[PDB]
Every structure is written in C-alpha cells, then in structure tokens.
Amino acid sequence: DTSGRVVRVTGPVVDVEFPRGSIPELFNALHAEITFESLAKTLTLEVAQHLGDNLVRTISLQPTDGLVRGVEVIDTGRSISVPVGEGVKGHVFNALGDCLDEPGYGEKFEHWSIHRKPPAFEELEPRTEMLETGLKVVDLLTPYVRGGKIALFGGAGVGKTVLIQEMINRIARNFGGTSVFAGVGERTREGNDLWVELAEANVLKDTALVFGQMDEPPGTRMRVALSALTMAEWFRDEQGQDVLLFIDNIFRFTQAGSEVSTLLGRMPSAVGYQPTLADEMGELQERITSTRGRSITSMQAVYVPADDYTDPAPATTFAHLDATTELSRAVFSKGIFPAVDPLASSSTILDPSVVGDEHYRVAQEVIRILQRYKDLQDIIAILGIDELSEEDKQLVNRARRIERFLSQNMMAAEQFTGQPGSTVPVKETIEAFDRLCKGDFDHVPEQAFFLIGGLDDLAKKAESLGAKL
Amino acid sequence: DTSGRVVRVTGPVVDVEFPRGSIPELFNALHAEITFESLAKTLTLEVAQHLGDNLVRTISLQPTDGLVRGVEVIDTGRSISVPVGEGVKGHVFNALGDCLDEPGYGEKFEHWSIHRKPPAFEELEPRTEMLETGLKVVDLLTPYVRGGKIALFGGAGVGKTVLIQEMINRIARNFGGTSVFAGVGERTREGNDLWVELAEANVLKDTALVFGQMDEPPGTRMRVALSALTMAEWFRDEQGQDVLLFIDNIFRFTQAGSEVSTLLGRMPSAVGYQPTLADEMGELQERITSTRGRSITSMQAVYVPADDYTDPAPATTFAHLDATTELSRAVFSKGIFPAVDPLASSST
Amino acid sequence: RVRAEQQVASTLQTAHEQLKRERDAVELDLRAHVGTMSATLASRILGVDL
Amino acid sequence: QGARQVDLIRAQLTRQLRLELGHESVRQARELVRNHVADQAQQSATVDRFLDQLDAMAPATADVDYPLLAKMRSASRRALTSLVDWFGTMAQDLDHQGLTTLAGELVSVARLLDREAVVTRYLTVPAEDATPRIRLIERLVSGKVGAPTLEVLRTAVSKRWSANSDLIDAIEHVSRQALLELAERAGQVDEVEDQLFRFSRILDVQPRLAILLGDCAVPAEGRVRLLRKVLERADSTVNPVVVALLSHTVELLRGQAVEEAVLFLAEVAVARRGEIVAQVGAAAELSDAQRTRLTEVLSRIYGHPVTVQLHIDAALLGGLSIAVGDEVIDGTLSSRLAAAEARLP
Amino acid sequence: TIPADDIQSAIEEYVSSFTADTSREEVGTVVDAGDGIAHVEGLPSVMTQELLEFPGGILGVALNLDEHSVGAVILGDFENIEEGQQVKRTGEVLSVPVGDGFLGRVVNPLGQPIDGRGDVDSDTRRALELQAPSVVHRQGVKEPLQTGIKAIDAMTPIGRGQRQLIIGDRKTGKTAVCVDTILNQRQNWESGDPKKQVRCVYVAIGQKGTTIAAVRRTLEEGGAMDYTTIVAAAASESAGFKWLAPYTGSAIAQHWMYEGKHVLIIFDDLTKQAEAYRAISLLLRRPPGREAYPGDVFYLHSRLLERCAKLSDDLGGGSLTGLPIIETKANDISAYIPTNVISITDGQCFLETDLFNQGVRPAINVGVSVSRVGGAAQIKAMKEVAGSLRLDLSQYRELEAFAAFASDLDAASKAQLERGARLVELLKQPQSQPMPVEEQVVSIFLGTGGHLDSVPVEDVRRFETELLDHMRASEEEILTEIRDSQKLTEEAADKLTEVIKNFKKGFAATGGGSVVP
Amino acid sequence: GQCFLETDLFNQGVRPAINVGVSVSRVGGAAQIKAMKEVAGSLRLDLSQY
Numbered sequence A: 001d002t003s004g005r006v007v008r009v010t011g012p013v014v015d016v017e018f019p020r021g022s023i024p025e026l027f028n029a030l031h032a033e034i035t036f037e038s039l040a041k042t043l044t045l046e047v048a049q050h051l052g053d054n055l056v057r058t059i060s061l062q063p064t065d066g067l068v069r070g071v072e073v074i075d076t077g078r079s080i081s082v083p084v085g086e087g088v089k090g091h092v093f094n095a096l097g098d099c100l101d102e103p104g105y106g107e108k109f110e111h112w113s114i115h116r117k118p119p120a121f122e123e124l125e126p127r128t129e130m131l132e133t134g135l136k137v138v139d140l141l142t143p144y145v146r147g148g149k150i151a152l153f154g155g156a157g158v159g160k161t162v163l164i165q166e167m168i169n170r171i172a173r174n175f176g177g178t179s180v181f182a183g184v185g186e187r188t189r190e191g192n193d194l195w196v197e198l199a200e201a202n203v204l205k206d207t208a209l210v211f212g213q214m215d216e217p218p219g220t221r222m223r224v225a226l227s228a229l230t231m232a233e234w235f236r237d238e239q240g241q242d243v244l245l246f247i248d249n250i251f252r253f254t255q256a257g258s259e260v261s262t263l264l265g266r267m268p269s270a271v272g273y274q275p276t277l278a279d280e281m282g283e284l285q286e287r288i289t290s291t292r293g294r295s296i297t298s299m300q301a302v303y304v305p306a307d308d309y310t311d312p313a314p315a316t317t318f319a320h321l322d323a324t325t326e327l328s329r330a331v332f333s334k335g336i337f338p339a340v341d342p343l344a345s346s347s348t349i350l351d352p353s354v355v356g357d358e359h360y361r362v363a364q365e366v367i368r369i370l371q372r373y374k375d376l377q378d379i380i381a382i383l384g385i386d387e388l389s390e391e392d393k394q395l396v397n398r399a400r401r402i403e404r405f406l407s408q409n410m411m412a413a414e415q416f417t418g419q420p421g422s423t424v425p426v427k428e429t430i431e432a433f434d435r436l437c438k439g440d441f442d443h444v445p446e447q448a449f450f451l452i453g454g455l456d457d458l459a460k461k462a463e464s465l466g467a468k469l
Numbered sequence B: 001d002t003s004g005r006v007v008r009v010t011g012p013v014v015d016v017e018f019p020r021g022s023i024p025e026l027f028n029a030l031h032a033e034i035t036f037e038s039l040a041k042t043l044t045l046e047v048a049q050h051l052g053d054n055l056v057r058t059i060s061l062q063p064t065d066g067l068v069r070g071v072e073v074i075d076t077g078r079s080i081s082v083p084v085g086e087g088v089k090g091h092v093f094n095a096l097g098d099c100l101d102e103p104g105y106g107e108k109f110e111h112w113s114i115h116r117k118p119p120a121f122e123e124l125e126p127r128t129e130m131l132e133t134g135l136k137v138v139d140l141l142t143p144y145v146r147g148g149k150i151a152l153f154g155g156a157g158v159g160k161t162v163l164i165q166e167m168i169n170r171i172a173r174n175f176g177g178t179s180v181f182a183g184v185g186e187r188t189r190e191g192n193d194l195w196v197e198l199a200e201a202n203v204l205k206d207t208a209l210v211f212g213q214m215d216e217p218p219g220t221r222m223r224v225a226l227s228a229l230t231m232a233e234w235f236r237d238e239q240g241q242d243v244l245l246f247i248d249n250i251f252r253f254t255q256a257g258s259e260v261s262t263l264l265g266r267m268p269s270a271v272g273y274q275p276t277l278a279d280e281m282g283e284l285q286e287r288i289t290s291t292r293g294r295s296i297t298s299m300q301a302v303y304v305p306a307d308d309y310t311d312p313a314p315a316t317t318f319a320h321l322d323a324t325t326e327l328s329r330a331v332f333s334k335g336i337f338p339a340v341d342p343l344a345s346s347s348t
Numbered sequence C: 001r002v003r004a005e006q007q008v009a010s011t012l013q014t015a016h017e018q019l020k021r022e023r024d025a026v027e028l029d030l031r032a033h034v035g036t037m038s039a040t041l042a043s044r045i046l047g048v049d050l
Numbered sequence D: 001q002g003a004r005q006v007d008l009i010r011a012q013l014t015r016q017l018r019l020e021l022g023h024e025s026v027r028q029a030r031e032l033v034r035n036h037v038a039d040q041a042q043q044s045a046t047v048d049r050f051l052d053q054l055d056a057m058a059p060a061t062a063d064v065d066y067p068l069l070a071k072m073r074s075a076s077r078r079a080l081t082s083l084v085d086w087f088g089t090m091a092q093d094l095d096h097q098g099l100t101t102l103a104g105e106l107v108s109v110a111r112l113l114d115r116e117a118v119v120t121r122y123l124t125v126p127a128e129d130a131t132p133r134i135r136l137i138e139r140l141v142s143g144k145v146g147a148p149t150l151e152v153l154r155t156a157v158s159k160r161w162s163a164n165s166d167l168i169d170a171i172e173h174v175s176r177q178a179l180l181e182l183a184e185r186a187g188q189v190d191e192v193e194d195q196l197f198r199f200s201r202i203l204d205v206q207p208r209l210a211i212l213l214g215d216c217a218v219p220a221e222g223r224v225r226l227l228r229k230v231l232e233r234a235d236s237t238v239n240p241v242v243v244a245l246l247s248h249t250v251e252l253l254r255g256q257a258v259e260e261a262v263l264f265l266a267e268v269a270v271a272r273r274g275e276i277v278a279q280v281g282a283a284a285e286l287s288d289a290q291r292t293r294l295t296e297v298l299s300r301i302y303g304h305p306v307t308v309q310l311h312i313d314a315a316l317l318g319g320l321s322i323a324v325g326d327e328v329i330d331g332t333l334s335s336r337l338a339a340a341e342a343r344l345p
Numbered sequence E: 001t002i003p004a005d006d007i008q009s010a011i012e013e014y015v016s017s018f019t020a021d022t023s024r025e026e027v028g029t030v031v032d033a034g035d036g037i038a039h040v041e042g043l044p045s046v047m048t049q050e051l052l053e054f055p056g057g058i059l060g061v062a063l064n065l066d067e068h069s070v071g072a073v074i075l076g077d078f079e080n081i082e083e084g085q086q087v088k089r090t091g092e093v094l095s096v097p098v099g100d101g102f103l104g105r106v107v108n109p110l111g112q113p114i115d116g117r118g119d120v121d122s123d124t125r126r127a128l129e130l131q132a133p134s135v136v137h138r139q140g141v142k143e144p145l146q147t148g149i150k151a152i153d154a155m156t157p158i159g160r161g162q163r164q165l166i167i168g169d170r171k172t173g174k175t176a177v178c179v180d181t182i183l184n185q186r187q188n189w190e191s192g193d194p195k196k197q198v199r200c201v202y203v204a205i206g207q208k209g210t211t212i213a214a215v216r217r218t219l220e221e222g223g224a225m226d227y228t229t230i231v232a233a234a235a236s237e238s239a240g241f242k243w244l245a246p247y248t249g250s251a252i253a254q255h256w257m258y259e260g261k262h263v264l265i266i267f268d269d270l271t272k273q274a275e276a277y278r279a280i281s282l283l284l285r286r287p288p289g290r291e292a293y294p295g296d297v298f299y300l301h302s303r304l305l306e307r308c309a310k311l312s313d314d315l316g317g318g319s320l321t322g323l324p325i326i327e328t329k330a331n332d333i334s335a336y337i338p339t340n341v342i343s344i345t346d347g348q349c350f351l352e353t354d355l356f357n358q359g360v361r362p363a364i365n366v367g368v369s370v371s372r373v374g375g376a377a378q379i380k381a382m383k384e385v386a387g388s389l390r391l392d393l394s395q396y397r398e399l400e401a402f403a404a405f406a407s408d409l410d411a412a413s414k415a416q417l418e419r420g421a422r423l424v425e426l427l428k429q430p431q432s433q434p435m436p437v438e439e440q441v442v443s444i445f446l447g448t449g450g451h452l453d454s455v456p457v458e459d460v461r462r463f464e465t466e467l468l469d470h471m472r473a474s475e476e477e478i479l480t481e482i483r484d485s486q487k488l489t490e491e492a493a494d495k496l497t498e499v500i501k502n503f504k505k506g507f508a509a510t511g512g513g514s515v516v517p
Numbered sequence F: 001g002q003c004f005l006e007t008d009l010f011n012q013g014v015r016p017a018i019n020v021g022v023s024v025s026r027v028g029g030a031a032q033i034k035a036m037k038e039v040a041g042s043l044r045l046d047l048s049q050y
Ligand SMILES: Nc1ncnc2c1ncn2[C@@H]1O[C@H](COP(=O)(O)OP(=O)(O)OP(=O)(O)O)[C@@H](O)[C@H]1O
Pocket: A347, A348, A349, A350, A351, E168, E169, E170, E171, E172, E173, E174, E175, E176, E177, E361, E362, E429, E430, E431
C-alpha cells in the first residue's frame, strides 16, 4: 500500500522509505508506533528532507526510545495542525495541539496548520504607540510599543522569567483582548507556576498556554512556538482583536534547530549553529507581527548564551525587534533589579516625535550621565574618587543615585524579597529623573533610592534613614 | 582528440577530464569558451591538482558564470606566460599578460612562464650591498639593500604615490634601470589614478604596470605578483638592468593564496592562513635578489591584520623584509617631504 | 496635519465601501462575457473554431 | 498620498477581478475541451495536428544514446567497449544452446563475484599484464565451467575497471547480449522489445511486487521463486527468451529498483539494433497509421531510427508528448491548459 | 470608478493572443531536496547561474554542476519542491528588468513589485553579473556627493563614484546616515538638471518588513521616493533572495549610470548578504574557512562594490556611489567580513555606541574615519573652511585630559580646548535633517573662524540653528552665491562676519549673558 | 538557581565560598519557613550592594 518503513533511527532523526509515488511532502506529519509496553506511544515525525531513492529524513516530536527499524509509517497527508478558535482560551496545550488541562478537549475544533507564510509586505505598517507599564527603567529608556515587537535579552539567570511574569501582571491583567503564552524549551516548574498564578488571578480564561519544555526532544522545542503562533495568528486574522503574545526563550527554538542540524546532514556554521540560522529565525519572526488594523503586541525572552551578546543567535534576533530590554549580569551582581542595562537597551519609539521633548531629553541626560560614570569607573577603582574633578564627583554621585533609582520593587519579585511591588506613572518617572539629573536629591544617601517606587516612596525611605527631600 | 571536457563547476573551481595520455602538467593554462552572448568569454584555468581517473582540478581566473558541463578544454602546454621585453614599458597588463590600455598589444613579444625558480645557490651574492638612492633620510637612517625588500607603511594623504614616483625616477636616472608596479588586489579607481598620475608625470615610459584587481577571482590576485616579477626578472637577467619592483599590499597576495587554498578544500592552518603560507611567500620573495651583478629591489606595502605583528601573514612577510619606511601624517603636516617618520622607520 | 490625515482617513472609509460596491456590481456584469473568452481560449488551444 | 492609497486599492481590486475572471474563463475552456474531446475522430485530428506541427521542428541535435556507458565514469568505457568489440567477432559462430549455456554460466559467475567482494578486489586491480589474475581465472572456475564462458571471462578481466562492481555489470551485460542474440537468431528480433516494455508497464502499476523483488537480502533463489509464476502465468509471456532475461535481472540486480532495471533491460534491447526508444503519451491508443507517421518523423527529427511506446492516459485530452532521451516535446492539451492558466495576467 | 470593460477586454485580448506553440525543451528531475537546496539529474546543457523552472512557478539558480546532478538554490516556496518533479531550463542567467519605471517602487531581488501598486514597465533587462567598468573606462572622482551630514561632508567627504563604508555596532545610526544622504538629494532632483540629479537605490537585505516600511515612510515624508527605488529582501525571504538583492539593486542603477546619470546605492547590512551566501555555500557543501565562510566571499563583496564607478566622458560620464553598511560585534573591525569590506572600499565612517551615548550624534569617530578621495570630493568653500578642522579636533582629543586644569595650561592650550569643545558641539545634527552645502559651509565657518569662542558650549547648537534661520530669512545672497560660485570670496566672508556680529548682539544665551566678544 | 563557589573567596576565609552576587535561588522565600523568610528578607541584595 501507501505505507512507509523505518530504515534508520539516530536519536531524534528517523529515516523512512516510501513506495514510488507515495513520498510525503515536506513538513508532513507521519505516524509510527512504539509497542514496548513501558514506552508504548505514537511517534509523530515531521518530514524534514527528501533524501532521494524514495527515502525521507524526518524529525521526531517524541523520544524514539523503543522504535524498531522496519515498522509501518502512515502519512497523514498534512502538516501538524493545532486547534484554533475562542475555545483554546483557558486551557493548556501541547506542541501537537493535545490539551493537558483536559485530555480530549479541542479534538473537534477547527484545526490550522502550524506552517505559514508571513503577511504580505503591502499589509505591514510601522507601530509607534507607547505601551505604558509602570516600570521606571522601561517607561523611561525602552518604552514599549502597542502592537510592536518587544524582547528581553539576558544571560542565564538574570531577570527574564521574572520580568516577563511582571509584564503578564502589568499588561495582560487589565487587558481587553486575547493572550497567548508559549513556553518554549523552559522549566516545567515555571510553567506550572504560571498556570496556577493565571488561574488565581482570574486571567487564565483569556489566555491560551502552549508548553514544550526542556525535557522534550528537539522537534517539540522547534514546533511549539509555531503552534502558539498559529493560535495567535487565528486570534489576529479571524477574530480580529488585540492579541498579546508571550514567548519564553524563543532562543530555545533556534537551539533546537542546532541539535538536529548535523544529524540532518548540514555542515556546521561559525559558532556551532546551523547554516540556516537567520533564515529559520526570519521565517518564524516575520509571522509574529501586526498587520494593518490587526494588532499583536509580542514580548519574547531571548537567552544570551554565556552572557555573550555577540553570539550569532541573539545577534540575529536583534534585527527583528522594536524594543529590546537588555539585562546584564554586571547589573545583577550589584543587586539592582530589574537588572536592565540602560546603555545597551533601546527602543525605536524613544523619539521626540513620539514620547515628547521632555521624555526624550530626560532619557538622553540619564544615558549621558550613566555613560560618563561607566567611563570613570576604572579611574575610581584604581585611583579613587579623590582624583576626579568637582564636576566629575558631582556626576558620579548623581549617576549612583540614578542607577539605583532605575531599580524597582516589582510585583512578581515579592516572592524573593518579601516587599510588595510598585507601579509608577510615566510622567512621575520623567519628572523624578529630571530632578535627579538637575541634582535636587544630591543630599539624600545612595540608599533610599534602591528598590522603591516614585517620589513618595523616595521621601519615606529617605526619612526612615534621616533625610528630607 | 587530445582535448578535455568540463565535468564539474563549483564556483571558481573547475574539474576537467582529459584522455588517458593527455593530462596537463600542474600549473598549465587551459582554455574553455563561454558562449552565452551576454557572458561570452574565454576562461583560463590553471591546473591545481591531479585528482586521478584523468580528472584535473583547476582554478579559474575569470568568473565561471555561463559555463556548461562537457565543453571543450584546450591545453596550451605551458603555464601562464606574460609578455617580456622593452615593449612592456608604459603599458598596463593583467596577471594573464593582456594589455589593458591597448588590447592586443604584446601578443607577438616573447612570452615567459610566470613560475620560475630563484637563482642557484652559486649565483647568489654572499655580501650585502647598500642601495644609494639619493634621499638624505633613506641613505642616512634607513639605508636600502640592493636586491632587498623594503616595507612601506604609508596610507592616503602622506605622499605614498609621490614616493613611488620618486623611486621610479631615481631607478631610471641614477641606475639606468626600470620599474615594474604590481597592483595585487588593486582598486580599479586607484589603479586608474595611478595610471593617469604616472602618465602626467612622464614616468609611465619607465614603468610597466601589472594590475590584478579586487573584482577578480582569487587566482588572478594570487598570480599577478608572479607576472610582475617575471617581467622584472626579464629586465634583470636578459636586459642587464637594475629593476625596482612595487608590490601593492603584498598581504593581498597572501589573502588570495588563502582563498585559493580554501576553495581547493585544503584544511586550514593556524589562525586560518593556507598550510603553505611560508612556502608561497618564500617562492615569491626569493626571486627578488641580486645575481650576476644586477639586482631587483622591491618596495612592498604591507597590511598588518588587527595591528598584530605576530599575525602569521606579517610574521611571514617580515621574514624577508630588509628595511621599513613608515610615511607619517605628522611629518606630512609639517611640510617635510618625503614624509618619512625617522623614528618609526628602520633598516637591518 | 492631524485634521488632514484624519479626514483623508474618512475619505478612505468612504471610498473603500464605494469601490467595493462598484466591484460586486461589475462582478455580475463580467459573467456575461465569460462565454466568448472560453470559446476563443478553446479555439486557440485546439486550432479550430469549435 | 491618500488619493494614492485609494487609487492603489482600486487597482488591487481590479487585478483581483482580472485574475479571478481569468481562472473562471480557463475553467470554462477546460470544460469545453474536456466534454468536446469525446469525439474519437477529433482526438485523431488533435494527433494529426500535433504531428504536422512536428513536421517542421526538424532537426534536433541529439547525439548517440548508449544504455550503460552513460554511468561508466572512467577506465570502464574503454574496457566494456573493447569487450563488446571482441564479442562482435566472438559471437558470430556460437550456436543457440551454446549461447543459452553461456548466459547461464555468466550469470552464475556474476552471482559468484557479487556474493563476495574480496575476490573482485584482487580481480579489479589495474595492470597492463594481468597474467596472475588470468591464473586465478584458470585455477578458480576452470574445472567447473565451459570453454567459451571462461574465454569471455578471460577477455573480460583483460582490461582495467573503474571499481569492483562495474565488472559484474559488464559480464551480466554480456549475458544480456547473448540472450538477445539467441532471440535474434530465433526470429523474435523485436517481439522481445514489446514483451519487455509491456511487462515493465505491468510491474509499474504494482509497487508491492516491484519493490519486494528488490530484496537485497533474500536468497537469489527466493527472488527467482518470486518471479517464477507471476511471470509464468499465461499467453502474456509467450516469449521463451524473456524468461531467462527477467530471471537474471531479478536474481542479480544489486539494489537497483526493479521498475528501473527492467526498463533498462528494454532500453538495452532497443539499443542493440542501434535504435532509440521514445515514450509518448496520448488520450487513447492510436491508429497504427499515426504510429508510422510519428515513428518516421521522429526518426527524421533525431537522425536515428526510433521505436515508440504509449503510456496511454486519458488525462491528456488529446495531443502527444514524446520523451526522447532527456528533452520532452509536450503538446498534450492538458499541459497547454495548465500553461494558459499559468500565463493568466 | 472601476474600469470594468477595460479589465474585460484586457483579459479577452490576452486570451485571444495566447498561442503557445509546443517545442522541445531539455528537462531534468529533482532527486533530493532539503533546506532550500535541490539537486536535479539531467539538464546536460544547463550553465552556471542559469535560472531553472520548478513546477508551480518556482525559480531556482544552478550553482553547483557535477557529473551526477545540478545543485540549485530555490528562490522561494521551497516547501513545494518534491523528489521526482520535472525541472525545465530557461536558457538564461539571472537578469532583472531595468528602467525609470522603478523610481518610487519596492521590488523583489527579481524586479517584481511587492508594494502592490501595479506593474513596472521596464526599458530592457540587464544581467546581474555584467562585468565592472574597465580600468581605462573610468575617471577620477571629482564631483562631491553631499550627504547633508556636517561630520561626513567636512571630515570624510564622499564623491560621485566613491564607496564610503558605514560601519558600526548596532543602533549607532548607520541607517539614519544613509537615509539622510538619500533625503539630501531632494533639491538636486528638484533642480531638474540631469548633471545634478541623483537617483537612489536602497537595498534592504534581511530586514524586518516593518523596518523596510518605516524606511519607506521616512523617505516619503521627505519627498525622496520621487527618485528612490527600494530592493527589499525581507528577513522571511530565502537565502537566495538575500544573496541576490544587492546584485539586483546594482543591476538597476547601472542601467542609469551607463546612461550618463548619477546614482547613489545603499546596501543596508551587507553582513546579512554575506551570511546568506554562507548559508547557501554550507548547504551546497562547499569548503568552509574562517568563520565558516565559503572562500570566495571577498570576491562576493568586491565584485559587487567594484561596479560602483565614475565613468569616463566617452562612456557618458555617469557614476554610481556605493554606501555599503557593515554591522560589527563589540566594535570588532578585525572580523572577517568587516576586514574584507574595509579593504574593498575607498573610505570608512566608523560609528561608536559610546560616542552615541555621550551625545555625539551622528556617532562618527572622526579620528579613525577616513576618505581616501579627500578634498577632491569637496567644493572649494568646504575645502577651505574645513581644512583647519581635523587638526583642531585631534588637538582637542589630546588635551581632553586637562579639562579641569585650564589655569595650569598654556593660553594656547586652553584656547585649543575651548575651540575643540565648540567644534565637537558644532558637528552634532538631528536625525532626518540634512543641510545643504552652503549652510554647512556657514556653520563650519562659524566654528573655525572663531565666532563661537564667545558662545557657551551648551548654546552652540541653538546659536548655529538660529543664525542659519536668520540667514535663510534675511541674508539669502551669501548662501545663494556660495551655492552658485562654490567658493567663499573675501567680500562674502566680510558680509558673513557682519551678519554674525549683528546676530550675536541680538542673540540671548541660556545663562543670561551676552555672546558679544 | 546556582550556588557559585569561588577559590578567591575561599582563600580570603569566606567559607562556604558562595559568591552572593551571582548566586541565586529561583524558588526564593517559598523554600523557607516564615521566620527565616522574615529575618532574611533582602539579605542577598543587601550583601550584593555591600
Ligand atoms: N543623528 C541622530 N540624532 C539623534 N538620534 C539618532 C540619530 N541617528 C540615529 N538616531 C536614533 O538612533 C536609533 C537607532 O538608529 P538606526 O536605527 O539608524 O541605527 P542602525 O545602524 O540602523 O542600527 P540597527 O540596524 O541595529 O537598527 C534610532 O531610533 C534613531 O532615532
């Protein structure tokens, strides 16, 4: 008949031979069986390459432990499909579209293929509307964009998950549309925490969760982002109302593509990555976008391997974003939270035409003071604060106070410090930082600027230290 | 009959199959015509490897766009040959010996193969001799070596072209000699500017220009220095004349060699340079020497990657250099010409 | 500026539906001309009037 | 710029209408020709239009076509051509039973040299005097084989080869040539060709039989058992030489797809007579006058006598599509409908 | 207003004019296909770089030829390629339609519009790999190509026919510099003179589509799409489009250069084009080298950048000016592709993140930036007012360590310190605000003549702005005859000094003081 | 989370050699009793700032 036959099994990569005229198309899903009772399951194999002589190289989405060469492989005739519609909100899904919250749910929904082309160029339009969060450093130096692309860059263990949960708290709770969260090759403890926390906050009913975690083979970690993207694309193109998309460690997607690269017969690229790094990242990132009149506000965590921002993966992720918050381990080690690097982060709408003259001028002066402080840090380390000018000492004091005032007690960090979180309006942020730059708080100690909210918290913590604003 | 046919085309690398008793020697030049009217040309292919089963691997000197498998390949029976003689003065050539300012000129001259051996051991001079140029700073602080190599470390706006003209004048008038300029990886704008400036200074009649330009495949950029050195060797040996050779960014010769080695699939070396970096550099620099009373002296511009003098390319180049002349902008700003830095320049 | 661009957005709001009306009005008109195009296409594919 | 916006969306809608009406009209024309083709005389008219069109394309620049020297990389074209040149005078005196025993013993030697590659390694080394290999020949099978088979084995080893397997290809090719010579002296000079081709088109429909005949581990006797009765069935295989050819193939195929190997056999058979085969299509079977016209005009086109095969499929709606060599002349009205759909503005 | 029967009779005349007579064609078969590469048995007559037609209207480029198959790069819709499909020859190498119909359009790396504004009527077609102008077909670079940025036009001048690499880390202002250069040709285009008009080509390689839309919006806000073409290979396109996009943008604008016209081309992040070529070359299993690059990537970029030329008067005198963009990582200009493109080009503008954060915008490192054409790409007025600028800035950089020790310095050294501070404040410029050359001459005259030594450092920008406003409103004769005569004669300088003194006695500093000397 | 031990801190006499600035626990105060969670509230941030 039209059935295949397993020929080679090398980890997650499986070669399958089909009869002439029955070779499956690229990206088709195939079904194989594992009958060993301890590991009995149905393997889903995505056609990756046409090898020739009727052979086909596929990637497995489940672990192939227990698979026998020669077993029958059924071609389903289409790519991987996931359920779409209003019924996916409130539930936790697999990378294949299977509900974990409630097994068997959504089996009769409409199903969309996870492989699409991005919107046409004549449908794209730049987004230049500020999304206000309540974090002083984000509102001031990296203002987010309504319907734009936001990213959180950072090395292992700086602030990415805490910051993205903070933004789920700040942006998605009082939101009026749909939310989609993609856990892409992350921790299962954090996924369970997020599920429970959305359930308690009564915000899970507006969220669709799709998880493929670190314990999954590289096929699941490659395709889970496409599944969640397909759900968000349905909410954008058919329902047409204000989607929020969160993707925790989109880098894992890329990393998964490099775990199977040499097994697929591809010569390695520079730093051990697949040669198709930028091409796959582009065909994925260009679907995460707003079209004309159809908004998707996206927020991605981007893992920076070995804290090296010159690594190819984050270096090519950088070009797909409207706002980037960059977290440093040097800021993390000083105890400043969120551990944002103010001099490396950016935003395309940090422009006098968008945010205003005063916002822009205050941001520029803050950045200039922090840059001068960074330039003086080496002299201060070796020669001391005494061999600086009076102007330089003034600037160093102002810069220490500024870099401490950029930190904030976050709502999602109360589990780490016991102190509740704070929301600061953007006008208060701008006015407070204008005062700091002019020097109106040069008499308040360096502390009392640390992990506070606005100017009222500044006054309270200054007087608790014996000072007056 | 005895002609080959193209089997594989992978970029600049072309594999050619010949009859059993007609395999061309290594470095031989083969001809294959591209007939697509938009890209019609004649590719020259230099045999690089004998692959076996009557296959040879060759590096193409022109872009292979439009080349078809199976086309006839003609073996010239010799390596790349350049025109030699007095007729090459005042004219511009490429690494193949084709006249650029007057196509078809020099086709009836004597032609010399560009792959030659250095002078025998019993013909070498065991005594170092200084080249009396006539410039005070050079003769005093950094005396040149007759038959030696001088690194030149000047950029734009410091009078490097004026110094090249000056050395052309001094070799043509104070020694009765000739100049050969080799533009290795030459920018076509700067090559045209050099041509026009030499024609307007009336020193072009004393100079033979050989340009292998940047928009060319690596084989031409790798062989242009050998072409210019072959012209210089004819002037030294057959004419009996002191020659001055100018190599443009000798580094670009090293870089083209590295690119050709990468295209031929050879495993790279330390940092990345071709495994035969020192061998190629020596095969080139050993032909620049004094023999039988006459000499070829060479002023070579050297690029230092990342300002690292321990980099393999400058470290291998400096194993053959005899003096160094660094043209400074601080000296050029004070109005001192030539703008030779007296403290940075040196001589062995 | 803002006046001009918001009112040209209004003109777009009008012209979009107006031209869509024109389109679905001619959609029924073109169907009368499909037969001749079909016949001539078949005639050119084959090479005879039928 | 707002006026530009409204004009451009207008033009986009007009273009959408353009292409949509175009697809509607091409579907309508497909309807007209699809329900208009049913007249058989009209299908004959389509064929004759296509062939009078062909009557002006002359000529093509097609060169010689050889079945097996195509993949012979180097040092084996010379070898196999010297071997066939020796056979050109070695074969003319043999008698029928001589040829059949020769073919049997040669395919036996082929299976031998296939089962163990270690001997073929010492048998495919290059040296202008292979008298040690000739000794190995004289001391390996001399007490088991006949005289002409060992003679052809000698003249086979007498040349260098690209690899090990190419020699086995050459020898079983010699067996093929001998079986075909036996058939040619039997008066079946072309019946074998149509037999091979029709069996190939039969095997093409069934992938089961086709692929499981390519069992690279089942005993060759198991393979020939597989072939036996599915071949020995009825009048559909009346030829008495094709049985041995197909048997040799199904036992000694070495990984090649049977669907491809039997067609290679047919192409060798048609190349023995110096002719090319042309695989054409149509809507229904022709009238043999059309076959004669097409055959002679294609022979004029390619400058070599040709023989046609008809993979008839009514999804062409008339016209023809020859497939000589590697260049196709597609004129099936299905392809023209597809083209007209593609060229739509 | 729908052109109904227009559409009707148009498709009708097409379908009546459809006579596709059937002829032979040499075909091949896909044997394997993966990751954007397909191998094709057959096609014995196919040539290198020949375009191939895969079923479904798919295009490929034959790059690898051998005795077994043809390795081809698919240019789009690769997920439709299947083993066994029939591949046809086109008999042609990659060409692109050229002509003036491309002004104001956004096209593929194939000449196909992607803006949805209709068809592009083309004069002819031009092959992508036509050779560069010969060494004898060229001319010295003599005419300035004004970018409108004072730092570039004063320190690293670009001429018509020159290649000025723009190289920087990221978010340092490279696209801003190139877009300001494009916008600065608006007055040249308005003049209507083909000797002064510059046609622009913006090639976007591997960019997010909304970034290309933002660039196009910035060009439309400034009237720069009347003379600009955009060749967009978005980040979602295949590696073949990202590899071909600069050659497509350079094939266009060579048709103009060979017609006696002057063109400016921007290759935005050639780094991504080199990465796409590396992806293609590694998928074709070509030998890698440093950073896994094919080994003819220097050739890839030099072949492209040597087609920017200044033609001789016999060839028409046209010119193509290239502004390639390179993104570095951690300011590492010794990386492979940065080294290559620095070697190829005629000059470099280095952009630093630190300089950007200090307020120096455009963030050009004037110390290391260089133009090898130099004063041959400047008018005489700019050549005269900016000759004392580089030494002044170098002296200021040397003396910056003595900022808080002015009393411990020679009077000349403190003068140099203050002059350098003023000159650093003078070379700053807002985004998307290029200046005509006469105003840059007046500004650098303000700087280097000494008329800013009395203005506070924190007021130099406002002083220059308001003085240029005054001169645009009141004294238009100075600017007009600087523009006409290309020099600043002594009487023009005298009137300029008079106007500066009157303005100074009118100007009001931020500290309440007077800027009167 | 990670407990990063350093030989420089070990030699200085800081034992255990935990680098408090780069060491962290992602579970946090949920992995403590209420007494420890209330006395060691911001102890890690305090030591990092110190
Ligand atoms: N001269 C300038 N003055 C003020 N702001 C500027 C200037 N040039 C650029 N900018 C700002 O810098 C930001 C980044 O600049 P730009 O996008 O041009 O850099 P880039 O080199 O294209 O970097 P990338 O390609 O990584 O985005 C922009 O938001 C822009 O507003």
